[PDB]
Design an enzyme around this catalytic site. Structure first.
Site, PDB file in Angstrom:
ATOM      1  N   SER A   7       0.888  -1.210  -0.095  1.00  0.00           N
ATOM      2  CA  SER A   7       0.039   0.008   0.054  1.00  0.00           C
ATOM      3  C   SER A   7       0.893   1.203  -0.102  1.00  0.00           C
ATOM      4  O   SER A   7       1.504   1.436   1.083  1.00  0.00           O
ATOM      5  CB  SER A   7      -0.922   0.080   1.274  1.00  0.00           C
ATOM      6  OG  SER A   7      -1.761   1.083   1.274  1.00  0.00           O
ATOM      7  N   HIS A  32      -1.193  -1.052  -3.959  1.00  0.00           N
ATOM      8  CA  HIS A  32      -2.371  -0.757  -3.620  1.00  0.00           C
ATOM      9  C   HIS A  32      -2.371   0.808  -3.514  1.00  0.00           C
ATOM     10  O   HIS A  32      -1.704   1.030  -2.664  1.00  0.00           O
ATOM     11  CB  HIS A  32      -2.689  -1.686  -2.227  1.00  0.00           C
ATOM     12  CG  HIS A  32      -4.178  -1.447  -2.075  1.00  0.00           C
ATOM     13  ND1 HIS A  32      -5.063  -2.048  -2.720  1.00  0.00           N
ATOM     14  CD2 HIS A  32      -4.840  -0.790  -0.894  1.00  0.00           C
ATOM     15  CE1 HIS A  32      -6.215  -1.955  -1.972  1.00  0.00           C
ATOM     16  NE2 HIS A  32      -6.155  -1.063  -1.081  1.00  0.00           N
ATOM     17  N   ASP A  34      -4.774   3.936  -2.047  1.00  0.00           N
ATOM     18  CA  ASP A  34      -5.886   4.458  -1.134  1.00  0.00           C
ATOM     19  C   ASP A  34      -6.178   5.884  -1.605  1.00  0.00           C
ATOM     20  O   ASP A  34      -5.495   6.621  -1.294  1.00  0.00           O
ATOM     21  CB  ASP A  34      -5.660   4.122   0.343  1.00  0.00           C
ATOM     22  CG  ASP A  34      -5.462   2.890   0.482  1.00  0.00           C
ATOM     23  OD1 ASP A  34      -6.523   2.041   0.357  1.00  0.00           O
ATOM     24  OD2 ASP A  34      -4.545   2.109   1.169  1.00  0.00           O
ATOM     25  N   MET A  36      -8.596   8.739  -0.598  1.00  0.00           N
ATOM     26  CA  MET A  36      -9.410   9.076   0.394  1.00  0.00           C
ATOM     27  C   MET A  36      -9.824  10.813   0.268  1.00  0.00           C
ATOM     28  O   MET A  36      -9.063  11.449   0.279  1.00  0.00           O
ATOM     29  CB  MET A  36      -8.448   9.063   1.807  1.00  0.00           C
ATOM     30  CG  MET A  36      -8.284   7.524   2.128  1.00  0.00           C
ATOM     31  SD  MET A  36      -7.350   7.610   3.814  1.00  0.00           S
ATOM     32  CE  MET A  36      -6.549   6.070   3.526  1.00  0.00           C
ATOM     33  N   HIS A  65      -8.315   1.737  -4.706  1.00  0.00           N
ATOM     34  CA  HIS A  65      -9.280   1.529  -3.655  1.00  0.00           C
ATOM     35  C   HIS A  65      -9.789   2.889  -3.163  1.00  0.00           C
ATOM     36  O   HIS A  65      -9.097   3.887  -2.739  1.00  0.00           O
ATOM     37  CB  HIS A  65      -8.476   0.888  -2.218  1.00  0.00           C
ATOM     38  CG  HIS A  65      -9.627   0.714  -1.085  1.00  0.00           C
ATOM     39  ND1 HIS A  65      -9.323   0.191   0.090  1.00  0.00           N
ATOM     40  CD2 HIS A  65     -10.827   1.015  -1.022  1.00  0.00           C
ATOM     41  CE1 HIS A  65     -10.394   0.061   0.980  1.00  0.00           C
ATOM     42  NE2 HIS A  65     -11.347   0.453   0.251  1.00  0.00           N
ATOM     43  N   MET A  67     -12.050   5.174  -1.219  1.00  0.00           N
ATOM     44  CA  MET A  67     -12.659   5.582  -0.038  1.00  0.00           C
ATOM     45  C   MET A  67     -13.319   7.119  -0.093  1.00  0.00           C
ATOM     46  O   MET A  67     -12.702   7.782   0.491  1.00  0.00           O
ATOM     47  CB  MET A  67     -11.666   5.219   1.348  1.00  0.00           C
ATOM     48  CG  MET A  67     -11.266   3.863   1.443  1.00  0.00           C
ATOM     49  SD  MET A  67      -9.977   3.728   2.786  1.00  0.00           S
ATOM     50  CE  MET A  67      -8.418   4.039   1.499  1.00  0.00           C
ATOM     51  N   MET A 136     -12.347  -5.654   4.153  1.00  0.00           N
ATOM     52  CA  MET A 136     -11.642  -4.967   4.870  1.00  0.00           C
ATOM     53  C   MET A 136     -11.279  -5.779   6.060  1.00  0.00           C
ATOM     54  O   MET A 136     -12.248  -6.181   6.857  1.00  0.00           O
ATOM     55  CB  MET A 136     -12.180  -3.458   5.402  1.00  0.00           C
ATOM     56  CG  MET A 136     -12.313  -2.483   4.094  1.00  0.00           C
ATOM     57  SD  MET A 136     -10.778  -2.251   3.284  1.00  0.00           S
ATOM     58  CE  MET A 136      -9.895  -1.652   4.773  1.00  0.00           C
ATOM     59  N   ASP A 174      -7.475  -6.321   3.510  1.00  0.00           N
ATOM     60  CA  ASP A 174      -6.775  -4.965   3.540  1.00  0.00           C
ATOM     61  C   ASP A 174      -6.804  -4.604   4.953  1.00  0.00           C
ATOM     62  O   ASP A 174      -7.955  -4.343   5.318  1.00  0.00           O
ATOM     63  CB  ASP A 174      -7.255  -3.940   2.520  1.00  0.00           C
ATOM     64  CG  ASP A 174      -6.412  -2.872   2.581  1.00  0.00           C
ATOM     65  OD1 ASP A 174      -5.562  -2.620   3.121  1.00  0.00           O
ATOM     66  OD2 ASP A 174      -7.337  -1.518   2.277  1.00  0.00           O
ATOM     67  N   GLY A 176      -4.024  -4.315   8.949  1.00  0.00           N
ATOM     68  CA  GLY A 176      -3.470  -5.048   9.565  1.00  0.00           C
ATOM     69  C   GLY A 176      -2.595  -6.468   9.164  1.00  0.00           C
ATOM     70  O   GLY A 176      -2.593  -7.369   9.897  1.00  0.00           O
TER      71      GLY A 176
END
Ligand SMILES: O=P(O)(O)OC[C@@H](O)[C@H](O)[C@@H](O)CO
Ligand SMILES: O=P(O)(O)OC[C@@H](O)[C@H](O)[C@@H](O)CO
Ligand SMILES: O=P(O)(O)OC[C@@H](O)[C@H](O)[C@@H](O)CO
Ligand SMILES: O=P(O)(O)OC[C@@H](O)[C@H](O)[C@@H](O)CO
Ligand SMILES: O=P(O)(O)OC[C@@H](O)[C@H](O)[C@@H](O)CO
Ligand SMILES: O=P(O)(O)OC[C@@H](O)[C@H](O)[C@@H](O)CO
Ligand SMILES: [Zn+2]
Ligand SMILES: [Zn+2]
Ligand SMILES: [Zn+2]
Ligand SMILES: [Zn+2]
Ligand SMILES: [Zn+2]
Ligand SMILES: [Zn+2]
Lengths: 216, 217, 219, 217, 217, 216
Positions: A7, A32, A34, A36, A65, A67, A136, A174, A176
């Site tokens: 990521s 990956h 993200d 946002m 991804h 969000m 998630m 995705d 942890g």
């Protein structure tokens, strides 16, 4: 097959090009990304123009991804930016099915993701349409969060459904994901593993990615 | 009363913010204009606080952050922590622009207020006493390369006049369509801080391109 | 269970609503499906309650109003007064679908509930005992001429199964891409009310066009 | 253990102190506090500061029910106001799981509620972190409404799930619970009963609460 | 300078838009005023671009579209393709009214700006240079048959003055409560385009009813 | 005439009855009631039903200030609750004019308020319609905040307009008003003064209100 997707949210934002190069040194096949918008989640990361800029410096699969609220308004932008996969939240639009059709009609692979608190049943009406299902394993918003093992149940459920329908989309996790939790993800049924904080906390990105392959 | 040049990072190479910031420090520019866009106040999403935080360690220049986002007050602490030196917010982005500006000041940053081309200068009147900077958009927010809007200069003159009458001393900034052929007018209207993206970064020799602006003034 | 045809006025000539309604009346269609869009729930704006009120005097048929609008409860009284016979609302358009449906019934109208293609059939479970009609979108709401979505028929079967388990008798409607080649499948899945827009109105002879659906139903 | 939770929304708002004292005279162990913001429901009731003021006038469990949008922004306020339980709507946020974690992290018991029209399925991924599951038996917004028996089906399904997962959270019902309906709520699987109008319409609160426990049998 | 009459189709027979448009073309009215409502900017929903598009072939008059919808920019393309000749948008419907007007012009249509009764005329100043029409609401948007608001005429006067000082030539329109007894005052205030709905369509003879306005002028 | 309006927002919420009684012991003629919905401002105070129960415990003028979005949907509710004056924010609706007409049509005195950051120009087209103009002297949200002197420039602008138009509405101020700031507010042209923390911080409310009468 099993894919590792570092990521970029966990990378050095001031040097995206060199971070992308470091990833390409590893055997990871995806990057990956993200997105946002401060609406779907509290913070703002980066948008389509940033992705377009990254595109020119990488040959890997751009696993985007979103969000963000109302993701269909960005389908064209991400297609132009070079996104290979566009994964959107069932909680971010009232028309998830149509949004997914839009992604595919634009020439990209379509991904659907659900938050930890969203039931797996929200995915059933979309299985025949998607190329990827992302579960998630942490509440979206940022990296370094605690793994939520309960979410692995939804991974199993979807894997079972995929079998029952004879479908073949990928199943991604995705949040942890690290050397101590990735094995559980694999056993649950996932084949794509996103990892941010764990991988980027090491200087030797190549060896860090290997710790995940070995854990598998 | 000094004239400052603020190259807009939105027009730079996003894959190399570090080197791009280094290029700016090679010029005589004192500010780095950073455009924050959330897909709500404007159509697109640029980058957020964490990106600014990353940029912060590769520049010693003034981080002039411009928030084109809805409800900016929620990001005051984030940008304070990110290293923003000035936080400029839109009167159109919140119902409580006065308190929002107070929050920025109390957070230890300089407070700037900006208004869109269609917003009247009177929207700034009640905020003159608390701001360190007034930004008059000379193009409709959203992206670079847009056509300069001369009519917006009337508002620059209007604010400059109010600044004098009240004997205040905040900086007056302009942003959008600012180039070697328009910067002089901005200066004459009363502005002293000039943001420029496309006109600067389209050039290979930034130090040289920045000088064309100085000369034009 | 009566098999009903509901021509969608969304596909008609908006400049001559009275005339288009007369054409529908020549057919054996029992309903006139009226799509209300507000530019929020879906991108476009079609027409509102006042337009429905104006159409009312030019038709004796069942006004099957489908609200693709956010927060439909605020329009219950308006549609009741406009003459709507059935008011069908989206589970995705309000946080209080149950109360919204109760409000429609309290206003003396038949209550319908509808779910988009991407919405699971379970969204319907707690509403079965109170509705008069369940609509399963077979295309994503927005406009006519779209491709039929077969997977949605799975939700038609599921609801028909539930209806049978609870001994209920509400109608089950489908809307989107319904034509002579897909209508039979909708029937076999459990639907008894079929909305059709582009397929019907693309034809100048509405009477024979509606009949082709009746024939395809073969029942 | 069966608990009765008088709903303060049905009490004399001009005298919360005395009303809370009246409740403490009965054997009710909870005080159900409905927070409404005019967004999740049409009306505005009262907020965190009101709960904070009520805090010292009661020794009972403050069972706070948030009928507001984006409840996560109020976790800290309610924790500091003295809330013992914080129950939020799956329909009020896009991140119900994280909101529940925030509640627990703030030291309060976490409760989750679903409206009559929301399927029990929305609860499945949350069973592991809640201390209470509330099934609305009336559409949220106001008291005196007619009980919705169909909702009991969800009370049973959750009870079953709780058993199958070896969990032990309480199951609460809220809306139209009276001496004629409480028994059914219990047989469905609920052990905590919220009652507003049925209790406060009576001058003798202790006796009225007793009618409910007697009805449980 | 040219006095124009714009019957509002909102007051016509919706089930027969074609014949209603023909009735209008029998008069000397040059505009058809089309009210677009989305249930957001105003309580009710009227009709959209597709309805306007359907009407287009039945009229050779100027389609004067008034958008009482939030975020009108998203509909510029639709209305352009629908055959709209004039597109008038509310300053209260977007945070970027200036760019919104630019978009209307770039799409090939005349751009109009309108302000509600409660909005000050100063909201128009920054926009005087790019508009072709300024519409001053003489009733609060939403529906017809409402009572005329004399106070709004002060804004018509203010704008007619600004047009003079700046030497511009945009039309000034009024809309709401305009009839044979109020149209005169509107004209005196400085308006040249008059929208009328209920007063005109309440008559059987549209041709003579429009004449009463001309005579009143 | 000069009026004092204690703000119930600063009182003891668990005893609204007794608190109103205290106010009635002073010569204050108004009870300022702040309605907050968590949208216009971040917090929620109390609604129309709370005001309704407060009604029978006071013979004073209920001066309700709605810091809520879309206040028009609450006119009927507050009229029924017993509100005497209803003051709304120009920043809370796109149709402030009609909203004010609605308040009057409902049999209540109509009031309009603007935030510290809002220009006096916003009131211009509303003067013929209101019975009261409130100029916030602090950013709405809660009490104890610092007086904002610059807002008095607006109190003066409206006072000046009131005269030029020969209108007779009241001019109220709210926020940071104490024995030290009230005098200025009066010289600025206001005649109705709201005070919360300054008044309720004392056990002897009767004398506290007099300290404001004196400072005038
Ligand atoms: O949990 P870790 O692997 O540190 O972080 C992963 C994040 O980068 C993740 O992709 C993001 O969507 C979470 O909101
Ligand atoms: O200098 P140009 O390319 O006109 O514009 C520069 C932009 O980066 C500008 O700062 C931004 O605020 C526009 O939304
Ligand atoms: O799919 P066809 O029958 O052409 O179109 C039908 C539509 O008019 C449908 O009723 C509408 O709800 C779609 O949003
Ligand atoms: O239905 P009764 O017991 O009268 O009232 C109960 C209400 O006070 C309930 O707690 C509330 O959440 C409803 O929105
Ligand atoms: O002429 P009257 O009947 O007052 O109103 C006509 C309406 O059609 C008006 O144009 C509309 O914009 C009001 O929102
Ligand atoms: O008098 P102080 O304590 O400054 O303020 C009192 C508050 O209760 C005020 O009325 C309120 O509108 C602030 O949002
Ligand atoms: Zn991710
Ligand atoms: Zn900028
Ligand atoms: Zn339909
Ligand atoms: Zn409750
Ligand atoms: Zn109009
Ligand atoms: Zn107040």
């Amino acid at each position: 097959t099993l894919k590792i997707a570092p990521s970029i949210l966990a990378a050095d934002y001031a040097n995206f090009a060199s971070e992308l190069a470091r990833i390409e040194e590893t055997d990871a096949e995806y990057v990956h990304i993200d997105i946002m918008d401060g609406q779907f989640v509290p913070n703002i990361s980066f948008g389509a123009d940033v992705v377009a800029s990254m595109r020119k410096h990488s040959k890997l699969v751009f696993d985007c991804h979103l969000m963000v609220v109302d993701p269909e308004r960005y389908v064209e932008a991400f297609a132009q930016a070079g996104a290979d996969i566009m994964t959107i939240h069932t909680e971010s639009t009232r028309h998830i099915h149509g949004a997914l059709q839009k992604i595919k009609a634009a020439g990209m692979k379509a991904g659907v993701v659900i938050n930890p608190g969203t039931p797996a049943t929200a995915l059933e009406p979309l299985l025949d349409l998607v190329d990827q299902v992302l579960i998630m394993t942490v509440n979206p918003g940022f990296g370094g969060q605690a793994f939520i093992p309960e979410c692995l149940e939804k991974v199993a459920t979807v894997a079972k459904w995929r079998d029952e329908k004879g479908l073949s989309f990928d199943i991604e996790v995705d949040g942890g994901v690290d050397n101590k939790t990735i094995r559980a993800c694999y056993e649950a049924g996932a084949n794509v593993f996103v990892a941010g904080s764990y991988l980027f906390k090491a200087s030797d990105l190549v060896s860090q990615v290997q710790t995940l392959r070995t854990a598998l």
